Amino acid sequence: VSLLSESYNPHVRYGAAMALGICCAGTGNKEAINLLEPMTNDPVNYVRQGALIASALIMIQQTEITCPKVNQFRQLYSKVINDKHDDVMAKFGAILAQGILDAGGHNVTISLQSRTGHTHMPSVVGVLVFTQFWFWFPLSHFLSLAYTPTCVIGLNKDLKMPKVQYKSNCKPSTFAYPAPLEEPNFQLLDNPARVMPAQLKVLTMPETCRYQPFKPLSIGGIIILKDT
Amino acid sequence: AVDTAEQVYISSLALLKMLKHGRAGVPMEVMGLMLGEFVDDYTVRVIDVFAMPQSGTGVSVEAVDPVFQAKMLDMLKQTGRPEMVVGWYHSHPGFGCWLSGVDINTQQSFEALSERAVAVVVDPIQSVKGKVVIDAFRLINANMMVLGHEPRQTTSNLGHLNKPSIQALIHGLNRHYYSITINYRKNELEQKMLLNLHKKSWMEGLTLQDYSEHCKHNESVVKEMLELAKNYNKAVEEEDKMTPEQLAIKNVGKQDPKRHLEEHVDVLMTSNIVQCLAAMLDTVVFK
Amino acid sequence: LNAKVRLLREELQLLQEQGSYVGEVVRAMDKKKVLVKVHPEGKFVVDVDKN
């Protein structure tokens, strides 16, 4: 799609940007963002708006570790939204970008996939109807069906609320919160805690509690605990 | 109480008649009244247009006795479609495609009858074969600037799909009025009619021109190709060692080899293989 | 080819801009000023550009 983003007609450039933004969405990718760096530098305004939207859709819940361009783009959103002389159709993308970036208190990531590669349906329907804000504003307000909370939880006797705290021995910056403006090896993640599928595979069950997670935990979902 | 994401439909005959009447009165401004309907509260359709006798000055054009207009709109009810007068158009030859001071004067009078009154500005001078310059304007209240004129509940009529010009932004544009986006609706009866008005029937397709003129034409093209290649020899063999960045600056004169060769290749091949193919078709189809 | 067609559209846009009056330089002056003369009219003490 890389050469297709450089077409003579800017509708195809908008479409190429949005295709990059909805295909590799939820996974921070180097080259897809690299194609979107010069996309927000062009005289046509709606392709600038689509470039901002597609770039904010692919930097979700990733704090300055897997992709190092997050802080520069986060400054770019505020720079465009605070500029006194810009296209209003362009700053539509700027105001919506802050919404789709820090969605749901950094707890929900849009993902068309699921646990095992099976296709997840409300997310796909939500993205397809999200492509219609060029024709109606409330029609592409549908995004909450595209948002799934990424947490590991699970309760022993139906509603028996346990206490599991362990997180892997990786440095506490890959999984860190954005820490808004307003060196321990291991970290602690209490019984409700977020986990994104970038270092989902690194965590371990704690070996201090007698309860064990039964299913070989590599999934964001529901577990049972056998208190031995 | 809201001006939504509006749209104007124009038919094919309306645009053709528009351009013909604009060209027929090329140095001055011609007049006209539009025929159509309000299909919904969102969009406005123009299905027909017609012209009237006028009376033109150097800077102005006025109407005549309007018993023509009343009797014409009475008689057009009888044959077929009884629409209404949804708008008016004029022409602006060589101008900025904009509403002037006296153009906006009668727009209030046309808007006082019906709210959804559309002005249309065409220009037959700046219009070229591939694209006709056209614009539709809607008068906005000059008393209300503090509020919004159109809420823009979507992004249809915006910097989307069109950009405001410079000369329209001088004489008015988003001031005192605004613009609306034009799309063309094509019905199947005219759709499968418009794409076939260039072909011929079977005598044109199967016709060898003549062989004497073909031989003389090939003789002439090969004869000039001789001297053209003789010039091409010196053009290649000179090739002064100094980077084309200035060899394109000494080429800007009358120099012509390497450029007329492939054109002669094209006009030789595409006139010989077609004639030979048609000769074979003629000699074994009829028998 | 895509660069060529985009250049043609942007050329149609940019061709509406103004021109530039040619002239000859009489002599340079102090504080980055030159003395130019246009063809029909007289002389002008003008400034220079950064490039």
From Swiss-Prot, chain A:
Spans of repeat PC: 15-49, 50-90, 93-125
Modified residues (N6-acetyllysine): 84
Domain of life: Eukaryota
Family the entry assigns: Belongs to the proteasome subunit S1 family.
Biological role stated in the UniProt entry: Component of the 26S proteasome, a multiprotein complex involved in the ATP-dependent degradation of ubiquitinated proteins. This complex plays a key role in the maintenance of protein homeostasis by removing misfolded or damaged proteins, which could impair cellular functions, and by removing proteins whose functions are no longer required. Therefore, the proteasome participates in numerous cellular processes, including cell cycle progression, apoptosis, or DNA damage repair.
Quaternary structure and partners: Component of the 19S proteasome regulatory particle complex. The 26S proteasome consists of a 20S core particle (CP) and two 19S regulatory subunits (RP). The regulatory particle is made of a lid composed of 9 subunits, a base containing 6 ATPases and few additional components including PSMD1. Interacts with ADRM1. Interacts with ZFAND1.
This protein's name: 26S proteasome non-ATPase regulatory subunit 1
Organism encoding this protein: Homo sapiens
Parent-protein residues present: 637 to 917 of 953
From Swiss-Prot, chain B:
Alphabetically ordered keywords of this record: DNA damage, DNA repair, Hydrolase, Metal-binding, Metalloprotease, Phosphoprotein, Protease, Proteasome, Ubl conjugation pathway, Zinc
Enzyme Commission code(s) on record: 3.4.19.-
Short motif (JAMM motif): ranges: 90-103
Stored InterPro entries: JAMM/MPN+_dom (IPR000555), JAMM_MPN+_peptidase_M67A (IPR050242), MPN (IPR037518), RPN11_C (IPR056263)
Modified residues (Phosphoserine): 127, 201
Top-level enzyme category: hydrolase
GO terms of molecular function: endopeptidase activator activity; K63-linked deubiquitinase activity; metal ion binding; metal-dependent deubiquitinase activity; metallopeptidase activity; proteasome binding
Tissue specificity field: Widely expressed. Highest levels in heart and skeletal muscle.
Positions carrying Phosphothreonine: 243
Residues where Zn(2+) binds: 90, 92, 103
UniProt-listed GO biological process terms: double-strand break repair via homologous recombination; double-strand break repair via nonhomologous end joining; proteasome-mediated ubiquitin-dependent protein catabolic process; protein deubiquitination; protein K63-linked deubiquitination; regulation of proteasomal protein catabolic process; response to ethanol; ubiquitin-dependent protein catabolic process
Chain ranges of the MPN domain: 8-143
PROSITE patterns linked: MPN
UniProt superkingdom: Eukaryota
GO cellular component, one term: cytosol
Function: Component of the 26S proteasome, a multiprotein complex involved in the ATP-dependent degradation of ubiquitinated proteins. This complex plays a key role in the maintenance of protein homeostasis by removing misfolded or damaged proteins, which could impair cellular functions, and by removing proteins whose functions are no longer required. Therefore, the proteasome participates in numerous cellular processes, including cell cycle progression, apoptosis, or DNA damage repair.
Protein family per UniProt: Belongs to the peptidase M67A family. PSMD14 subfamily.
Name of the protein in question: 26S proteasome non-ATPase regulatory subunit 14
Protein source organism: Homo sapiens
Gene: PSMD14
Curated annotation (Swiss-Prot), chain C:
Domain of life, per lineage: Eukaryota
Annotated compartments: Cytoplasm; Nucleus
Functional description taken from the UniProt entry: Component of the 26S proteasome, a multiprotein complex involved in the ATP-dependent degradation of ubiquitinated proteins. This complex plays a key role in the maintenance of protein homeostasis by removing misfolded or damaged proteins, which could impair cellular functions, and by removing proteins whose functions are no longer required. Therefore, the proteasome participates in numerous cellular processes, including cell cycle progression, apoptosis, or DNA damage repair.
Family per record: Belongs to the AAA ATPase family.
Subunit structure: Component of the 19S proteasome regulatory particle complex. The 26S proteasome consists of a 20S core particle (CP) and two 19S regulatory subunits (RP). The regulatory particle is made of a lid composed of 9 subunits, a base containing 6 ATPases including PSMC5 and few additional components. Component of a complex with USP49 and RUVBL1. Interacts with PRPF19. Interacts with TRIM5. Interacts with NDC80. Interacts with PAAF1. Interacts, in vitro, with the thyroid hormone receptor (in a thyroid hormone T3-dependent manner) and with retinoid X receptor (RXR). Interacts with ERCC6.
Protein name per UniProt: 26S proteasome regulatory subunit 8
Protein's organism: Homo sapiens (Human)
Range of the intact protein held here: 52 to 102 of 406
